[model samples]
Each structure stands twice: as structure tokens, then as C-alpha cells.
Target: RNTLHEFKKSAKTTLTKEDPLLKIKTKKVNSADECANRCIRNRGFTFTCKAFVFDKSRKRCYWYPFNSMSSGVKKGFGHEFDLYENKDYIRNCIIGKGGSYKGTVSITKSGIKCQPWNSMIPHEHSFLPSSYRGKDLQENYCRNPRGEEGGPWCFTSNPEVRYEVCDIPQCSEVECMTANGESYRGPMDHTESGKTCQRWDQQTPHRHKFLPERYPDKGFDDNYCRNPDGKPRPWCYTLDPDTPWEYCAIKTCA
Candidate 1:
């Protein structure tokens, strides 16, 4: 993987170019590996370039900005481009992270346990386009990363990192206990309806204020919920007029 951010070559896998962690459109390069070096020079501390899609057809390397296992990515149906995702992204994905999809288990008519979620990958991975419908994607591996053909598995955050034995968490059920305004811990409960709750990280949908283009602050991008490591995290929201989206701490549960 080297400095190229753990680029790996595999089949039936490519990071779908959507909700990019980081994107840099470059012209051309000598080799696919050479294309990998392009992002290192910029010294991006916030988001590391984990994968690169060197589209020989287009003569461009599409570098995904976000690293770690939690990046929005999908599978590749064709081999039109030279694609690669880093090991860090893949490992975290295999274990669980931002984009990992946990699966639900059930009994079949034949009395055999079965899981049917992802269409292409089958039980190998699960995908949630919207958190409103299911649990939020986490940065941990599924209990069974690689399930039976119809078993539970997680999607690869890094397209370069293909399917393997990974953890499969049950569908996410965000629940929060509140007392009028005891401060928000997680997703709200009906009993707390119309009640205001507050948290440290961005957990709900809230209006966010950016530093604006060409910010005078120089380097730091004070935009969203980030960890102490300076890495971006989720945001929280409320009906408050002055603030819709604000920074809050992301607290996980068992």
C-alpha cells in the first residue's frame, strides 16, 4: 500500500463516485501507482486520500479524500477504470466504521438462518442510503463480516478493499431517553416530543455555518463535528431558529 494509501487491485469492486471524502481531479500519469503519489504532496491532514480511480479512459485519477473505514462507497459493476482503496479504509470497514453496513438475521421457511439485503453483494454486505430508514453506519466491523451466500456482511468503505470475514451488527435502532430537557443523548423518543435536548456533537439535522470561502483563519476548516484528532464526525440538529445544525459529541451504545 505504501504512501499510496493502501491501494489494492480487485474485481467486482470500485468506489462509487458519490459523497466523496476528498476529490482531486488531475490530468494524467505514468502508472497507476504514480497516480497515487499525487495527493501526498498537498499534506492534507484532515482527510487523507485513501483510494484513487485512475480512469485510463479519461486520463484522470479520482482520489477519495476521506480515509478510515467510514466512507460512502458502492460497488463497481464494470472494469472501465483502474480503481484502488487504502488498507486503512478497508480494515476499518471490514471491522466497522463510518460506512460499514450491519445485517439482520432471521429464520427461513426451511428453518435455516438467512439474510438478504444488498442486491449485488448478496449477504456479503448491507447498504443504507438513508439513516432515517435504518441504523447509522458505524466505524466497526460486523460480527460476521463475511456471511454465508445469503448471510450477513458489511459493505466495503474503500472500494479497493473487497469482501472478507467481517462483523455484521444488527440493524441500528437509535433510541434516546429524555426528561423534558435532560439533554439529548441520541435519537429522540416520542415521550420527549416537543421537548428540547442538547448534546456536544452534531447528532441531529441542524443548519451548519461554514468558515466561508477564502477564510482568513488560514488553515483550519471549522465546518462540522470533528473528533479531537481533527477528523470530521456527525452533526446534531433541532428546531432552534438561531441554530439548526450544530456540533455535538457522537456517543455510541451497546
Candidate 2:
């Protein structure tokens, strides 16, 4: 399977030629692979180039802000054209409630395939792409437009089942923190010894200070490890009663 942000290749395909609103750029390249590399190395900061088309006949490449799968962007036939789309836009892991996930995963947690958002064969839903604009309700990808706490889910293709949560993994890799580890805000929820951290709002197992109310600027929203009292590193209250607190395994920036 293609990893996140890698380009997926398609042959004999190109996006719609005449789109007035499409932000497209052109470049002369030697080969189709070179075109894909150019799209990856694109330094244009104004708009993200999510897809590219390589013209074999003219040895020219085209960069597009919108992919072929994007809503209202239609794919067209072209014998000399090859399409390459970046998978980063198709989010594999979700952050928070996954309300903004626009991935193309079409399976439920229970191993049942998902019913298309527009299809009513196995199940019918009010969650149409037209009703939820900018939500990327295209295809059978799991989504959470209603901002459900359980994360992204989709209607099942099974006739008996209605819907189930998709098995989308939560993004937990925290970026390197400051030297003092005071400004760390990624989802590192475990101690160095692999003990789960206690929530800052809860006072169970072992808890004293570091409540969310006391330190509003500490970003103590979840049980993730944090450095509130200027510790040597980010530490959290562990769930283990014997081990009240321990430092987390967070990396420090050089």
C-alpha cells in the first residue's frame, strides 16, 4: 500500500482541460516520472499542487491544485497523458475528532465495506456530499461532518448494519519540543515506562496539582504528557497508584 503523501500513478488519464477556476501550472519535463518528481519538489507556497499530469506527446507536465478525485473536478480520457495524485490529501490518520478527514478509506471497523455517501442500496443517509459542502463526502470514505466524539465513521454496505466507526488510527507522534519541554503539545499520552497518563481534569489514582483550570495556558486538554511545573522534561501523572508521576519520552529540539 502507498504510504501517506506518496504519489499514486494512473495511466491514460488527465483532469478536465477547460476549468476556469482551476489553478494549474505547466512545465517542460523529460519523462512522466520526472513530472511526478517536479510535483513533489514544487516550491509554490501560494497554492498546494495535489496532482499532476504528464503529457507524453509534448513532454510537458501540468500541476493542479485540485486532484481528479476532488469534487467538481472531472477526469478525462487522454492516450498520451498520465495522472499522479498525492495521497497526503487523502488523510490516513485523524487528529482530534476527525471532523475534517477527507480520506478515501472505504471500510468499516467490523470489516464490512462502506456504502457510498450517495448510494442508498444498503443504507440511506442525509449525509450527502451536496448537503455537507467542503466536508469531502465523496465516495465511500469514512467521515464525521457532525463532529462526533468517536471520530470518523461511515454507513456500512451490509444490509443489516447501518453504520460503524472506521478503524482510522489517531495521529500520536509528537514533534520535538523546546529545551525545557514547556511548550509540548503533541499526543504523547504515555510515560517513559509505557504507563498511561491520567487526565489533568481527573483526580483519580494519584493527582495533586496540574488541573486544567489552574493552568489554562498549559494546554492540558487530554491525558497527554506535558511539562507544567518546569520539570527537566515533560512528565504526567500516571494511572498506576504506586508510580504517581514519571517523565515522558519526548524528544527535545537541538
Candidate 3:
């Protein structure tokens, strides 16, 4: 099951009362998860979002990039919404690939060959001649995996795809890493080379993507590796898609 975090509830806020800068407001979203996802993915907005407020009256989610001093709660005047803040400032605390993620699947190349999303940066960068304006939602491959929380998926540079869901190895399955505090159920393997890794998802022969923001060169034509055990340090990865699940080299670190 996909894990979710509980947000603290606040009193109703009226439009006439404490007012905040409305960076981007949208209606008709399924849940807080979907609302935050759209808010973060948006590029035309002026200020980056710091928190999200959900209005119970209109069933709308408001993305607030300001603070309490800059914005406050309302009591009347047709404004009633529940406020939520990401004090931890972590992304993808809600959705993930396949399981809870509601996005659809696109057509990939013929056979089901698996490749880490980090490996596709070079291919995606080459496909685009210049920086993107976040046009195609499918091209924003970063939508699927929640790497900020130690997820296996990240947005790819490929416009032909957005995210690829690979099988999660039992040993590699983490309980979702949080910057503030979190817990998981599994065992990680540590090596003499100062390398720690997890067991790859053994279910299917599919590939997962990584978020470009967390990578060294931003997944731009750079070959990067990650620790399956959900460590802060990067690992040495192989490009061959058909290699064994343990293809990531255990680096010799002190």
C-alpha cells in the first residue's frame, strides 16, 4: 500500500480576513496528493510553493508560496479551507509509481527492457535542443517517482515518455525516506568498500526513473548511480539495461 502523511488542520479562513498571495489556484482535483503534484509541476507561477491549502467549501486546493506573517487564516466572507504545510520541505511525500499513482501508461519501445530513469537523461537532453517550458505533461517524466523520498522513479528527459514503473525488489523496497523523520521495514546490505545497497525489485524486468533536480548534473547526459538502500551518497551505475539487478557497482568509499 502507498503510504501517506497526515497534515495538521487549521480553522476556517475568510476572504475578508487574513489574506495571502495567491500564486496558483486550481479546482476539481481528486485529493491533496493530486493538488500538490500539479502545484509543484507548474512552471509559469512567480513564486515557488511553500505550502498547500485545501478549501472545503469549493473543494479546491490553493498553492501558497508565502509564510504565516505574509498570509493568515480567514473566518468568513465565503473562504473556508484546510491549510497544510511542508515544514520538512520534501517533495513527492504522497504519490509514487504504479501502486497509488493514477497516471496512465504510454507506449514504450517493442520489448520490455528496463533502464533506470537517471540513465535516460542523456537521451532526453539530446531529444530537446533547448530548455523546455513544461509544455507536454507526458514529457515531464518527473511526475511518477518520488525521489525526494528515496523513490526509484524520477522524471526523464524523454518527451516520448513521462515515467516508467519497474518492479520493486523486496530488499530494495523502502518505507519512504523523509528529511525530517521516517521509518521503514527492511534490511540493507553494507560492504567493506563503504557501499550500502538494497535488493532490487525482483517482480518484473522494467525500469524506474529519477528526479532530475536531485542528480549531480541534473540527469543531463550524465551516467549516475544510486544506492538501492536509500542512502544519501550516489553510487556507480551501469548503462546496460539487460544487466543483472545488482548492476550498480559497490563503490570503494571510506
Give TM per candidate. Answer: 0.30, 0.42, 0.28
Q: Considering summed lDDT, which 10 consecutive residues are worst modelled in model 3? A: 1-10
Candidate maximizing TM-score: 2
Residues 1-254, model 2: lDDT tens digits: 11112455666899874666656678797765566566656665355567888898899988887887677777888999878776445545666687766777888888889989888888877988878865667688888989989888989989899999998776444366778888888766668887777767567777587767778899886566788889988888887889989998876666
- What's the distance in Å from true for residue 78, model 2? 24
Query: Highest lDDT, which number?
Result: 2
**Candidate 1 overall Cα lDDT vs. reference?**
0.38
> Sorted on lDDT, highest at the top, how do the candidates line up?
2, 1, 3
Model 2 steric clash pairs: none
Full-model lDDT for every candidate: 0.38, 0.74, 0.36
Query: What lDDT tens digits, residue by residue, belong to model 1 across residues 98-165?
Result: 23233222332233333323333333443442322223233333323323343333444334444333
List model 3 lDDT by residue over 28-74, tens digit each. 76565566565555554665554566776567776666434233543
Which parts of model 2 have CA positions greater than 4 angstroms off? 1-88, 173-254
Where is model 1 poorest over a 10-residue stretch in terms of lDDT? 188-197
Model 3 earns a TM-score of 0.28
